[PDB]
Amino acid sequence: YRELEAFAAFASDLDAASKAQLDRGARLVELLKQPQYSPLAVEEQVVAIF
Amino acid sequence: YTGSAIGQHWMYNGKHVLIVFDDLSKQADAYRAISLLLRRPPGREAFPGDVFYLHSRLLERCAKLSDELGGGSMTGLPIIETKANDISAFIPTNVISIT
Amino acid sequence: ADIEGAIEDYVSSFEEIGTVIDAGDGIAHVEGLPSVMTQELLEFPGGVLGVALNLDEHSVGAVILGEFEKIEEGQQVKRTGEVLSVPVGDAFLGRVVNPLGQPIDGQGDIAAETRRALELQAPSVVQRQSVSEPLQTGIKAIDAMTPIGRGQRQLIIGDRKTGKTAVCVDTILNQREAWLTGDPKQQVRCVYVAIGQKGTTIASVKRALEEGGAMEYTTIVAAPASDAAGFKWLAPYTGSAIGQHWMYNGKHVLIVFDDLSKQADAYRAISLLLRRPPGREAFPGDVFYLHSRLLERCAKLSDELGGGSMTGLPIIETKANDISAFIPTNVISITDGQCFLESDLFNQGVRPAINVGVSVSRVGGAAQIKAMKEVAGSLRLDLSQYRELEAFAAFASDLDAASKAQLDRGARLVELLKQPQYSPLAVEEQVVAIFLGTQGHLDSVPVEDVQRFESELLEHVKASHSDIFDGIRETKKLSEEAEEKLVSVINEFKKGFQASDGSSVV
Amino acid sequence: YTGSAIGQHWMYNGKHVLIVFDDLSKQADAYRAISLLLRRPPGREAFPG
Amino acid sequence: TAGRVVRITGPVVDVEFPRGSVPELFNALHAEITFGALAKTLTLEVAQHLGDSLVRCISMQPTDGLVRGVEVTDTGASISVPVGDGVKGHVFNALGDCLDDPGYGKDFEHWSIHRKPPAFSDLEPRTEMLETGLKVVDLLTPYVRGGKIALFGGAGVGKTVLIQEMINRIARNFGGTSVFAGVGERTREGNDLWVELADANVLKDTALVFGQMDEPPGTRMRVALSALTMAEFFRDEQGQDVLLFIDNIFRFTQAGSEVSTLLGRMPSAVGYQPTLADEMGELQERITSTRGRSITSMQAVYVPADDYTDPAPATTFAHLDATTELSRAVFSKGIFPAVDPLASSSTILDPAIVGDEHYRVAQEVIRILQRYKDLQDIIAILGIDELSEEDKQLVNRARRIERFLSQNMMAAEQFTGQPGSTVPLKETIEAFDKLTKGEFDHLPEQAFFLIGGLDDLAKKAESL
Amino acid sequence: TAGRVVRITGPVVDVEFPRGSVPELFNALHAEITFGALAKTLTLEVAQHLGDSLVRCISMQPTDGLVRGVEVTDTGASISVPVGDGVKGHVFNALGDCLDDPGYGKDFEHWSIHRKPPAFSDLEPRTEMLETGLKVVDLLTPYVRGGKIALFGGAGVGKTVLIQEMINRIARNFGGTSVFAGVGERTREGNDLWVELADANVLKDTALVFGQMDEPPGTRMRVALSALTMAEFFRDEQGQDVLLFIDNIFRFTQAGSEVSTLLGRMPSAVGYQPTLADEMGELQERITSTRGRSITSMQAVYVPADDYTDPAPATTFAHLDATTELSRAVFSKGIFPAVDPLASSSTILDPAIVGDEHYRVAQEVIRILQRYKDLQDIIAILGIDELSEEDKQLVNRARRIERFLSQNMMAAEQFTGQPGSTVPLKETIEAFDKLTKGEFDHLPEQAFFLIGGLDDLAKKAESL
Amino acid sequence: PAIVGDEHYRVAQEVIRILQRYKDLQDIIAILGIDELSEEDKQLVNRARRIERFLSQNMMAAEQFTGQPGSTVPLKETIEAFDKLTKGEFDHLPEQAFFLIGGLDDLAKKAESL
Amino acid sequence: ASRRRAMKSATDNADDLIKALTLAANRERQAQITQEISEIVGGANAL
Ligand SMILES: Nc1ncnc2c1ncn2[C@@H]1O[C@H](COP(=O)(O)OP(=O)(O)OP(=O)(O)O)[C@@H](O)[C@H]1O
Numbered sequence A: 001y002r003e004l005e006a007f008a009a010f011a012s013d014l015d016a017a018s019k020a021q022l023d024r025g026a027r028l029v030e031l032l033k034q035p036q037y038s039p040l041a042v043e044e045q046v047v048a049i050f
Numbered sequence B: 001y002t003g004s005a006i007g008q009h010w011m012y013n014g015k016h017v018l019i020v021f022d023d024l025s026k027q028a029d030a031y032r033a034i035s036l037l038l039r040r041p042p043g044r045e046a047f048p049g050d051v052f053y054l055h056s057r058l059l060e061r062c063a064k065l066s067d068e069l070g071g072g073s074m075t076g077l078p079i080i081e082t083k084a085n086d087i088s089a090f091i092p093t094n095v096i097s098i099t
Numbered sequence C: 001a002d003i004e005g006a007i008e009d010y011v012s013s014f015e016e017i018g019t020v021i022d023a024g025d026g027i028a029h030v031e032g033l034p035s036v037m038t039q040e041l042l043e044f045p046g047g048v049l050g051v052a053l054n055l056d057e058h059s060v061g062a063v064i065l066g067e068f069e070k071i072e073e074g075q076q077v078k079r080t081g082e083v084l085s086v087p088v089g090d091a092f093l094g095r096v097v098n099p100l101g102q103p104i105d106g107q108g109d110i111a112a113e114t115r116r117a118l119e120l121q122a123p124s125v126v127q128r129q130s131v132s133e134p135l136q137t138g139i140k141a142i143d144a145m146t147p148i149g150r151g152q153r154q155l156i157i158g159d160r161k162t163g164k165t166a167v168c169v170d171t172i173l174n175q176r177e178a179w180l181t182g183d184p185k186q187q188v189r190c191v192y193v194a195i196g197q198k199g200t201t202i203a204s205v206k207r208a209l210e211e212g213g214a215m216e217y218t219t220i221v222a223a224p225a226s227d228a229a230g231f232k233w234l235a236p237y238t239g240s241a242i243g244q245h246w247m248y249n250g251k252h253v254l255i256v257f258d259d260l261s262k263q264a265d266a267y268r269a270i271s272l273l274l275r276r277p278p279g280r281e282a283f284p285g286d287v288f289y290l291h292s293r294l295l296e297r298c299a300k301l302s303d304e305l306g307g308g309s310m311t312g313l314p315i316i317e318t319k320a321n322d323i324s325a326f327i328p329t330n331v332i333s334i335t336d337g338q339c340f341l342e343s344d345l346f347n348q349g350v351r352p353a354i355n356v357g358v359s360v361s362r363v364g365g366a367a368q369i370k371a372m373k374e375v376a377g378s379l380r381l382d383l384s385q386y387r388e389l390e391a392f393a394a395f396a397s398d399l400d401a402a403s404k405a406q407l408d409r410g411a412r413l414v415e416l417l418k419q420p421q422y423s424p425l426a427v428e429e430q431v432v433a434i435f436l437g438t439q440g441h442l443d444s445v446p447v448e449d450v451q452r453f454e455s456e457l458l459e460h461v462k463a464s465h466s467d468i469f470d471g472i473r474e475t476k477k478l479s480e481e482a483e484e485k486l487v488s489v490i491n492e493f494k495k496g497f498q499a500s501d502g503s504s505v506v
Numbered sequence D: 001y002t003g004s005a006i007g008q009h010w011m012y013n014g015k016h017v018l019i020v021f022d023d024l025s026k027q028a029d030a031y032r033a034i035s036l037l038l039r040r041p042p043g044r045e046a047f048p049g
Numbered sequence E, F: 001t002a003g004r005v006v007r008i009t010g011p012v013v014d015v016e017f018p019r020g021s022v023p024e025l026f027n028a029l030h031a032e033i034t035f036g037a038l039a040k041t042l043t044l045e046v047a048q049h050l051g052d053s054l055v056r057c058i059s060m061q062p063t064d065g066l067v068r069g070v071e072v073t074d075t076g077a078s079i080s081v082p083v084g085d086g087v088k089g090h091v092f093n094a095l096g097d098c099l100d101d102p103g104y105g106k107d108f109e110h111w112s113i114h115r116k117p118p119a120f121s122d123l124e125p126r127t128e129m130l131e132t133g134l135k136v137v138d139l140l141t142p143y144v145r146g147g148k149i150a151l152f153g154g155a156g157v158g159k160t161v162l163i164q165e166m167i168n169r170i171a172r173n174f175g176g177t178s179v180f181a182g183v184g185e186r187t188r189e190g191n192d193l194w195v196e197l198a199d200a201n202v203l204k205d206t207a208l209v210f211g212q213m214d215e216p217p218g219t220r221m222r223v224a225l226s227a228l229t230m231a232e233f234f235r236d237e238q239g240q241d242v243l244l245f246i247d248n249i250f251r252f253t254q255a256g257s258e259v260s261t262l263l264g265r266m267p268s269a270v271g272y273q274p275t276l277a278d279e280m281g282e283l284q285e286r287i288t289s290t291r292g293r294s295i296t297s298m299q300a301v302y303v304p305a306d307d308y309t310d311p312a313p314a315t316t317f318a319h320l321d322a323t324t325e326l327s328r329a330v331f332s333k334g335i336f337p338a339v340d341p342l343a344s345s346s347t348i349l350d351p352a353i354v355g356d357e358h359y360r361v362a363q364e365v366i367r368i369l370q371r372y373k374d375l376q377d378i379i380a381i382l383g384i385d386e387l388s389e390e391d392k393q394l395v396n397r398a399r400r401i402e403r404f405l406s407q408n409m410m411a412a413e414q415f416t417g418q419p420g421s422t423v424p425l426k427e428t429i430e431a432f433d434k435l436t437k438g439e440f441d442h443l444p445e446q447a448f449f450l451i452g453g454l455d456d457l458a459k460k461a462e463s464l
Numbered sequence G: 001p002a003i004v005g006d007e008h009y010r011v012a013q014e015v016i017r018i019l020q021r022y023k024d025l026q027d028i029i030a031i032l033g034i035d036e037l038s039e040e041d042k043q044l045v046n047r048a049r050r051i052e053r054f055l056s057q058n059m060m061a062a063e064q065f066t067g068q069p070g071s072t073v074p075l076k077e078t079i080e081a082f083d084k085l086t087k088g089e090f091d092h093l094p095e096q097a098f099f100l101i102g103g104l105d106d107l108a109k110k111a112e113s114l
Numbered sequence H: 001a002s003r004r005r006a007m008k009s010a011t012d013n014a015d016d017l018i019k020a021l022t023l024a025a026n027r028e029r030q031a032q033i034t035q036e037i038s039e040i041v042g043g044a045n046a047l
């Protein structure tokens, strides 16, 4: 996703597969965001990544 | 090394330790100061030749001991402050080759 | 215990004459001279002179001031008893002198009014006054965008063969009009300190000043490349001493140092030969202190101390236009403003090759007469806009009308700031020239003819409508009546101006 | 220098020689080593003056 | 008991003392220069012990005229600077000697300039923000109480006027005091600052300590510490919040490097002293908030070669909590304090320390200003007519936002007559919230210039 | 009375003398090497007085074979060289020993190799152009008759070829005396020069002094001074116009640097001796002309590491009236003589001297080439068609001007095979005026390559 | 060629030539991208990317990192594959197919997967 | 429109290249200063 976003920053249009990749990455990156001083137990981490 | 000794005492007693160093870049600079005041000829980036040693000797003691020695462990989380994302600099590369 | 007492008595036991125990490369070590003081002037048997820069418990390390080969081990060294001092007075105007004040032009001896130590302290913060009166350089770029006020330190910084000495010699020449008036409050004196320049280059500078009539108020402190490092190191302080004698008496002085890069090299050589610890680029730890002590003498004294001033124009030669080098950084931090002269602009036809932009004068508007401040206020922004829009010279057709107007205005302001060598412009002529451009009166002239149009219109105003120039010089501001008259004269002249391409102007 | 001497013996006897020095850069490094071990103060790039 | 000068190597002087009376490190010794033209009382700061009872010292005055074997008298204490309310309103040098009224302050209490930073247990664990009362600072680049703030700029961007503004605000709002540490200060600029502060009548709230460039590197290195000693006295004893200016910190670093070279130490990194970080910490870490009182600091930092990776700024910036960058473009647009809203930054501007609403409003303002800066190229080259309706609306919002970041600064009173404004932070957040939501984007642009908040905005709008 | 070698370290030898007989600085001492294969009389030059009657000397011949304790005799005078009309037509080494006829000058007048430069009173600027027949030199960097000329260039960019060409162009049509100083250059070049001068019957008016690079550092330091002493004898004692070619003057400073550390001097800048400027100024200011007696000096200068910011070239630039800066970029492009049109300069290129017509064409050529240099960045990446029409036409003009600045030089017949050419100054001015105005824009680029004038340009264009 | 054979040396030299040309074109690729190159150079850069990625391989020691088992490619197959790559016989396959693939057969497998 | 997008991308790439080259140039400048100081002080230590 980190390179597909750079490609899409200037690509006129994207295929359905590329759109799916971009839409999944833009949500995975948001998921990995985490507030300071708020560690998550391993169970909660695995659920969130699930 | 004070932190590493404190951690090693627990490590060899069968307990698990987590040692953090914010930041080993400032230790390298400090040792550069001592080594230059001792007039030891510098190397790359004005660091002494044994600067790598300074860190490896440090970070090489963070180990997962065998069951024969109690099974303790010490996990190192050294912090390096790169300068403008220069991950190819001297101290960053040294600590990446150690870690 | 008693051993310590005997040693104390022996040490407290101490004309005084020493002996040269070591000599070489311009440095001589002098055993003895227990009462020598740092930077004392020592005299050697052959008439040679030295400066006791190092004082160890063993020997005095003295830099020999030229004529070094006559020094031998065992020669009797005699101390002068006084620190480095130079003669000073009005007799130094029109004379060429080595850093010790001894003439080298071959004319008669100089009638010294007094002797000044080279290391007298600079005026303190409370002895100074705000830099508030212009020092007209005659260079449109400097006087319009990086003004130099009396008491300011303006660093001419640039690569080799870029126009630095030309700018400074033009500055010196431009003071002739102020000299002839005879008023000490306008009358500006000049000292041109040549460090490491070849003798014929100093002679060419002398020729330029003399043909331009400047030498009746200008002094040259010459430390040619031949002279020992001691002279190349002391020459700026000799010039500063002369300028300070003139300054504390109420006169206004312009000190040009050409180049401080060569003073730093001389001091580096002396220090390294003296085994002083080197720093970056092998310079001793006190090179910044060297140049600061040199340039902080320049100041404008409070009216309690006569109101005199000394304006510095330190020239420094960069390498590959690297202004981050050690001496450039030190002098840039020391000085009040910088004229960055670049070779790329010089080749492109910008003359003097001042990079308007990075070049700045911290005194700013306080060093401009009201007329220049009003007319030249918009010049900087217009040039900035032109330099931002220059990439569109190829596609101007697609630019907005205002952007095209800005581009055309800038392409003519840049020509307006061009100026031939040794042709300084009085302040009123500069005011009129910048008026021609900033007010758009050049918008109708071809870019190829802006220079000649300026020159011819200035000559026309001088010959026939001199009222404008007299008004500007007497009032220091361009009055509305004078502005209207100048616009009328511009329009009348444009009818009689023959463009290079045969076109016409309206 | 040994190769140059061996070649020079033939050269001064009227014969044509062709000397190849692979690498003069490694000679400079060796001379630097000798000088630094003799404690000559080095010049630029740590090489002997 | 007194020593003898045995070596003079420029600023460095070696002094031999009796076996039992060698001075300790950083002691101040006095040595007489008797030559008439250069008569002086050199202050030498002991820097090293060379053995055999020789101590190597850095001369705080030029050593020209000094003679071998001249008596050197130890003062028994480090370089001591006068402290007290009596130091306010005057100008001192790095050695505590008054420069405008010589002999003044010799009877005050004298504090050693070498003092340990506050004990570890005495430090405040939570970073409190300094409500300056300036819209732009309190919104986009909030200063940290007891912290350090970079101050980029130059001549013609109102740096001196902003310094006057901060002096006024610390003096009136917080009832505090200011100390201006002119490290490497141009004597012309020192005199200009002195007369401008006297004219503004804020010198009475400020103590000036100028380590002039013409002085050897020792004074330029110790002037920052002397000013910080005065600030520490105002903090710990007088119980006042202090604002310590340093212009320029890079010159303190450079003086330290030059001294290190003079003493013979091998240079490190790019030629700086091996102890660069140690000196920088000893200086900055004394600038902190303790026992409820804080020494805030505004430091002008020179980045050599425009390189933020050079060890000087790299070590300085490890300590700076905020950055304020004054720009020519903003200044020419008539906006005072002339802070560039985008280049300037603050490390306390996180939703954890400042409120969530504050962070949201600041981020919206930053976004609008960034978009306006991006469209500035189009506006200048093709004209505003090319912009779309949304782009024109955003430009209208951004013009007024950036003009509202301007403020009728207290320092401007002397030049205009109207009193300076002190907008409470809540009012600033609310006003900029409204501006980004566009509740005022219909008012004329001239209404937002130099006004103190929201009620002043309404009153000036009604005036127009 | 005689000395005694105490310490030998490469080219530096320390000699201990009795107390009352220490030789003066720059005196010449004689030692003896008795080893059969290397037997000789070794000339030492006193460089320092170390104390305790020890002097430290540079060896003018290799010290191989020298034995500690070997007697050293003092000549009582500095190294002296023969002077007179006799030196013309002969080959000398740095010590004044004739090579092509050993023992030739032993009975001539001998002058000390060391002497002060003429006083500032005698100096007068020179402003007469020396037309040489090369397009680039005559147009952009006019040479000064009686002034100082230099040929800067990195390693192997054609300094020797160009200096030989200018010998051919000036000396061969010049009635006065000429002196060549082969300071630390290739011996093959010197031998070829000697053979060429003998064949052209110019040797009888030329005195050659060689200290080529096979010699130890002392000979390279002092060969320049020896040749220059011959030059000043021809100047002051005969009032005759003199040419002093020096190839290569940088070797003087380099030899100084080689012995700098052995003499006890701390290194400076990039490994150079601290006395670089002093020594090179002492040598250079002797080369100047004095009113009524002119030395037209032409000295090649080497640029170490191909870096024009190196201290030696940078300090040499100040001693020169005309400067032809060769560059490896132009050489790689194939534009021989490889002169850099932009970096090169001449102090006589003034509209008040060369005439406004010459100056205008020179400045137009410089402007065109500078614009082309700026555009080369865009062209290599964006392409040529993306430039402005005016800039595209200027690029064409600039390429043709760069290739026309090339010339088939007489001494470069070996490089190209074709014979050389002499382009009159007026023809050069007209040709470059036309090029800048575009009257030759329609011809192909190769028509201008290695072509000596307009007639040859037309011939080549018709050939292509 | 006297040791590894004429075919091996020829294929190696052609691969090195293509990669050197790609490196020389990096200066333009970084700014303007692939679009502005000449058509011959465009084709060269495409097969250069494919060659650069095909030189990648899934090593056994990499399993512990990637999980995918390592692969061994004999010399003959490597020579044939890179000869085909240089001749352009695989310019129609996506670049993603050549990551860590190790072989012609497995290359076809991954291409079918994509 | 395609030219606009391509040249915006080219300008961004050139800005990134300028940043990377400025970082590299600063690193080389610092390295040159450190190396020169090392040579100077190494000569000094040997005296
Ligand atoms: N304003 C100008 N217009 C035209 N030519 C100029 C101008 N200023 C300088 N020049 C020319 O530029 C060349 C170098 O000028 P100048 O002597 O001022 O250089 P400099 O920067 O002092 O260099 P340096 O002393 O290092 O040689 C000379 O040919 C001089 O005639």
Ligand SMILES: [Mg+2]
Residues within 6 Å of the ligand: C164, C165, C166, C258
């Ligand atoms: Mg000059």
